[PDB]
Design a protein around this ligand. Structure first.
Ligand SMILES: *C(=O)[C@@H](NC(=O)Cc1cccs1)[C@@H]1NC(C(=O)O)=C(COC(C)=O)CS1
Length: 359
C-alpha cells in the first residue's frame, strides 16, 4: 500500500477522470520521496477481459522522445557528437542548400525551420527519407521558430547514434535501457511479451501503432508502469546513476536550450520553473498550442538543469495516451499510462492536482 494521502488524492483524481474520458485501462505511478507507488484500473484487452497489471505494456507515443533526448545527451557526454555540429557532418548526402546552417541542436529541439509534424507515410526507406529531407523547404530560418515535429527529433536520434556504430535500437538498449534496468521497455515487443501488450482503443476499436519511418526515435517505445516509474526516478536523481556518461546525458536533456513564453525546451523533456501556473501547463498542452509554431529565444549557454522545475512530456498514439511529469527539487513525479488517446489538458490537470497535493 501507499501513504493514505497518496491513495486519497489518486483515487479522488483518477477515478472521475476515467469515468469522464471513458478510459478502458489505466496505470499510474506516483514517485514520492523517491519511491514508487502503483495503481491500476480496468482492462488491457476489453473483449478478452484481461486487466491492466503492473506488467502491462502501453504505447508511450511521444514520451519516447525523452529516451531519444537522453540517448543524445549520452552521446554528447561520450564526446561522439556536439549539438553545434552541422546535420551534414553525419549525413553528407544531405547536400541541398537549405541544410547549410541546420545543426543537431535545431533537429533535437524542433527549431530547424518548419520540419513537419509527421514523416509522410509514403516515406519508408532511407532513400525515401533522403528525398523527403532534400525536397523539404523551410518556412523560417533555423533557430527562430519551434514547431513540434517527429521528423525533426526523429532525425536527430538517427544521426546522434552514427559515431557509435550502433543502430538506434541497439544504442538505446545498450546505453539507456540496460544500465537503468528497464527490462520491460521495448522499441519492438518480442513475441513472448505480446501477451502483456495492451490493446489501444480508438472509437471503440482495438488498435496498435503502425510502423513508420523514425518511429523508434519519435514515438515507438512501449513500456510498463514499473519501468516508467524507474525512468522517472532516474531523471529525478541522476547522481545515483553509476554510468557517468548516462548521468551526464540525463542532466543535458534537462538543460534549457530555448525559451518560448514560460516553457523551456530540453532534449525530449520540456520544463517550466516551479511553482507553475497550472492554467499555463494545462492550456499549453492542448494541441492548439502544443503543435503550433512558436517563436523561440536562444539560451546561450544552455541553462544547466534547474532542480526547481516542472519537467514533463505528453505522448499519444492512435489508441494510447501517456503523460510523465516530475519535480526534481521535491523528489516527486507521476506517470499516467492509458489505452485511450484522451485530451492532453485532462492529463496535465490530473497530474498537477496530484503532485500539488503531495508537494
Ligand atoms: C506524440 O505523442 C504524437 N504522436 C505521434 O506522432 C505518434 C502517433 C502514431 C499514430 C497516431 S499518433 C502526437 N499525437 C497526436 C494524437 O493526438 O495522437 C497528435 C494529434 O494530431 C493532430 C493533428 O491533432 C499529433 S502527433
Amino acid at each position: 500500500a501507499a501513504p493514505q494521502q497518496i491513495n486519497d488524492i489518486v483515487h479522488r483524481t483518477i477515478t472521475p477522470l476515467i469515468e469522464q474520458q471513458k478510459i478502458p485501462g489505466m496505470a499510474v505511478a506516483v514517485i514520492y520521496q523517491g519511491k514508487p507507488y502503483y495503481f491500476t484500473w480496468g482492462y488491457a484487452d476489453i473483449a478478452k477481459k484481461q486487466p491492466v497489471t503492473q506488467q502491462t505494456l502501453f504505447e508511450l507515443g511521444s514520451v519516447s522522445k525523452t529516451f531519444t533526448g537522453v540517448l543524445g545527451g549520452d552521446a554528447i557526454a561520450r564526446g561522439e557528437i556536439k549539438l553545434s555540429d552541422p546535420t551534414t557532418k553525419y549525413w553528407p548526402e544531405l547536400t541541398a542548400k537549405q541544410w547549410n546552417g541546420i545543426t543537431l541542436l535545431h533537429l533535437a529541439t524542433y527549431t530547424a525551420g518548419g520540419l513537419p509534424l509527421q514523416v509522410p507515410d509514403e516515406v519508408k526507406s532511407s532513400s525515401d527519407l533522403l528525398r523527403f529531407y532534400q525536397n523539404w523547404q523551410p518556412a523560417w530560418a533555423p533557430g527562430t521558430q519551434r514547431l513540434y515535429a517527429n521528423s525533426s527529433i526523429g532525425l536527430f536520434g538517427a544521426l546522434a547514434v552514427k559515431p557509435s556504430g550502433l543502430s538506434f535500437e541497439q544504442a538505446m538498449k545498450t546505453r539507456v535501457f540496460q544500465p537503468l534496468k528497464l527490462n520491460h521497455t521495448w522499441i519492438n515487443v518480442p513475441s513472448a511479451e505480446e501477451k502483456n501488450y495492451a490493446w489501444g482503443y480508438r472509437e471503440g476499436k482495438a488498435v496498435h501503432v503502425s510502423p513508420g519511418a523514425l518511429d523508434a526515435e519519435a514515438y515507438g517505445v512501449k513500456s510498463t508502469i514499473e519501468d516508467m516509474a524507474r525512468w522517472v526516478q532516474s531523471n529525478l536523481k541522476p547522481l545515483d546513476i553509476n554510468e557517468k556518461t548516462l548521468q551526464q546525458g540525463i542532466q543535458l536533456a534537462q538543460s534549457r536550450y530555448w525559451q518560448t513564453g514560460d516553457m523551456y525546451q530540453g532534449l525530449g523533456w520540456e520544463m517550466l520553473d516551479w511553482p507553475v501556473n497550472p492554467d499555463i501547463i494545462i492550456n499549453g498542452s492542448d494541441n492548439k498550442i502544443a503543435l503550433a509554431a512558436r517563436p523561440v529565444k536562444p539560451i546561450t549557454p544552455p541553462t544547466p538543469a534547474v532542480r526547481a522545475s516542472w519537467v514533463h512530456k505528453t505522448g499519444a498514439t492512435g489508441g494510447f495516451g501517456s503523460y510523465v511529469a516530475f519535480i526534481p527539487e521535491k523528489e516527486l513525479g507521476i506517470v499516467m499510462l492509458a489505452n485511450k488517446n484522451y485530451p492532453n489538458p485532462a492529463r496535465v490537470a490530473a497530474a498537477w492536482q496530484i503532485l500539488n497535493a503531495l508537494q
